[PDB]
């Protein structure tokens, strides 16, 4: 079997992408953030403390004929965001884009963090990292991909994120009209339970490709591209007017600027971020200063190939028993 | 802006 589903940015900035997911019987549709940096599919629900739900469509499990309590099981989660969330845990039918999985753990929020309450556009998150990072206890629960796998035509999903525009998550097949040229595959480590890979170098605009290993994660959950301090400093170097801002928290540059592209290596291949991708948008409203979309990972502690790097590309998450990461230009 | 950082 396969699935396709469209995924639409939640603002004009491309801060985050939501994709509708069908839960229960009859279907409730929720718009979840697919997030490949975490392994929990949680949803705002009829259990969520009222004072903590502002606009989001909740999952009610009592209205699902298919639902069942997973008694014992609780779950608790914090994000790099310092975002957080806890609840208890049902199993229910979940469909994405017409790929159905039964007995998916669906973790139903009793509480949420203020960041999430405030975020009226995201109903919940769908986690797409390795199951070793699932937070349900006492026994971990398999992601929707892991559940799906046994029925997919191929055990893959692909992320075609859009630049200020919709795009598509595909489960079970690779859509060869979606990208240009060939896919390059690189090796994944699940030691930390992430889509963690090593990029091979990088070049800023027209300049030399420097060959220098950048281990990072592929995380459709993060907005910007987080790279080591010297690489970010190198790139921002070719933009006068740009500087670091402890006020606003990273590199900012005049909106009118014309950013150089950014090339990251994937094996012997190369993927080009347009400059225009790397212009996140003016730092507050009407400002002539924009925030940059390349930023220093050094406070985080891990390089993150967020949404700004992924949306330049067609990315294939290959989850055979020796999982790999495919990247093609589009 | 309004970055997001999903673990």
CB atoms within 10 A of CB A256: 8
C-alpha angle with apex A99: A94 to A102, nearest 5 degrees?
Answer: 40
Which helix (H) or strand (E) segment is A84 a member of?
strand A84-96
Nearest CA in chain A to B6: A221
Contact assessment for residue A296 and residue A304, using Cβ atoms and an 8 Å cutoff: no
- Pick the catalytic residue from A14, A33, A35, A40: A35
E strands in A113-266: 124-127, 136-137, 156-160, 167-171, 180-187, 196-204, 210-218, 225-227, 243-245, 250-254, 262-266
Bridge-based pairing of strands A250-254 and A180-187 is unpaired
Q: Which strands sit side by side in the sheet containing A289-292, from one edge to the other?
A: A243-245, A250-254, A289-292, A279-282
State whether B4 and A37 contact (CB < 8 Å). no
Give every CB contact of residue A210 below 8 A, 6+ residues apart in sequence.
A201, A202, A203
Q: Tell me how far CA of residue A163 lies from CA of A11, A175, A193, A308, in angstroms.
A: 11, 19, 28, 8
Resolution of the model in angstroms: 3.0
Whether A35 is a known active-site residue: answer yes
d(CA A204, CA A74) in angstroms, rounded, equals 47
d(CA A25, CA A104) in angstroms, rounded, equals 13
C-alpha angle with apex A271: A268 to A276, nearest 5 degrees?
Answer: 160
Compare CB distances from B2 to A13, A80, A300 and report the shortest one's residue.
A13
d(CA A290, CA A267) in angstroms, rounded, equals 32
State whether A80 and B2 contact (CB < 8 Å). no
Contacts of residues A140-144 at CB distance under 8 Å and 24 or more positions apart, as own/partner, are A141/A70, A141/A73, A141/A89, A141/A105, A141/A107, A142/A105, A143/A39, A143/A41, A144/A41, A144/A94, A144/A96, A144/A101, A144/A104
**Which DSSP string corresponds to A10-33?**
SSTT---EEEEEEETTTTEEEEEE
Residue A203: burial class (beta carbons within 10 Å; 0-12, 13-18, 19+): buried
Residues of chain B in contact with residue A18, where contact means CB-CB under 8 angstroms, are none
The partner residues of A305 in beta bridges, in order of sequence, read A218, A225
CA distance B6 to chain A (A): 5
d(CA B3, CA A45) in angstroms, rounded, equals 25
Contact assessment for residue A314 and residue A164, using Cβ atoms and an 8 Å cutoff: no
The partner residues of A125 in beta bridges, in order of sequence, read A33, A42
Nearest CA in chain A to B3: A223
Bond preceding residue A138 cis, omega within 30 of 0: yes
Assign A80 to helix, strand or coil: coil
Please report the domains of chain A, with CATH numbers, ordered by start residue.
5-174 (2.40.70.10), 175-330 (2.40.70.10)
Q: Tell me how far CA of residue A212 lies from CA of A9, A233, A248, in angstroms.
A: 32, 15, 30
**Which DSSP string corresponds to A279-303?**
EEEESSTT-SEEEESEEEGGGTSSE
> A65 is written with which tokens?
């004929």
Whether A199 is a known active-site residue: answer yes
State whether A80 and B5 contact (CB < 8 Å). yes
């Amino acid at each position: 079997s396969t699935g396709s589903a469209t995924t639409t940015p939640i603002d004009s900035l491309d801060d985050a992408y939501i994709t509708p997911v069908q839960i229960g019987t009859p279907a409730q549709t929720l718009n979840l953030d697919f997030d490949t940096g975490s392994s929990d599919l949680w949803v705002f629900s009829s259990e969520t403390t009222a004072s903590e739900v502002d606009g989001q469509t909740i999952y009610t499990p009592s209205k699902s004929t298919t639902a069942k309590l997973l008694s014992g099981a609780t779950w608790s989660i914090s994000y790099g965001d310092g975002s957080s969330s806890s609840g208890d845990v049902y199993t229910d039918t979940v469909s994405v884009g017409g790929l159905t999985v039964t007995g998916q753990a669906v973790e139903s929020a009793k509480k949420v963090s203020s960041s999430f309450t405030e975020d009226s556009t995201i109903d919940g998150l769908l986690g797409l990292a390795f199951s070793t990072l699932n937070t349900v206890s006492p026994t971990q629960q398999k992601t929707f991909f892991d559940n799906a796998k046994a029925s997919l035509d191929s055990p893959v999903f692909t992320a075609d994120l859009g630049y200020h525009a919709p795009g598509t998550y595909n489960f079970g097949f690779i859509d060869t009209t979606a990208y240009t040229g060939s896919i390059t595959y690189t090796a994944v480590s699940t030691k930390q339970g992430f889509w963690e890979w090593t990029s091979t170098g990088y070049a800023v605009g027209s300049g030399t490709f420097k060959s220098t290993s950048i281990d990072g994660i592929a995380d459709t959950g993060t907005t910007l591209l987080y790279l080591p301090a010297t690489v970010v400093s190198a790139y921002w170097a070719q933009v006068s007017g740009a500087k670091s801002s402890s006020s606003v928290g990273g590199y900012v540059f005049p909106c009118s600027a014309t950013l150089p592209s950014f090339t990251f290596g994937v094996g012997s291949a190369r993927i080009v971020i347009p400059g225009d991708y790397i212009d996140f948008g003016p730092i507050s409203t009407g400002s002539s200063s924009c925030f940059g979309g390349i930023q220093s990972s050094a406070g985080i502690g891990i390089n993150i190939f967020g949404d700004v790097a992924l949306k330049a590309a067609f990315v294939v998450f290959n989850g055979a028993t020796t999982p790999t990461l495919g990247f093609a230009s589009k | 802006x309004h970055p997001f950082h999903x673990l």
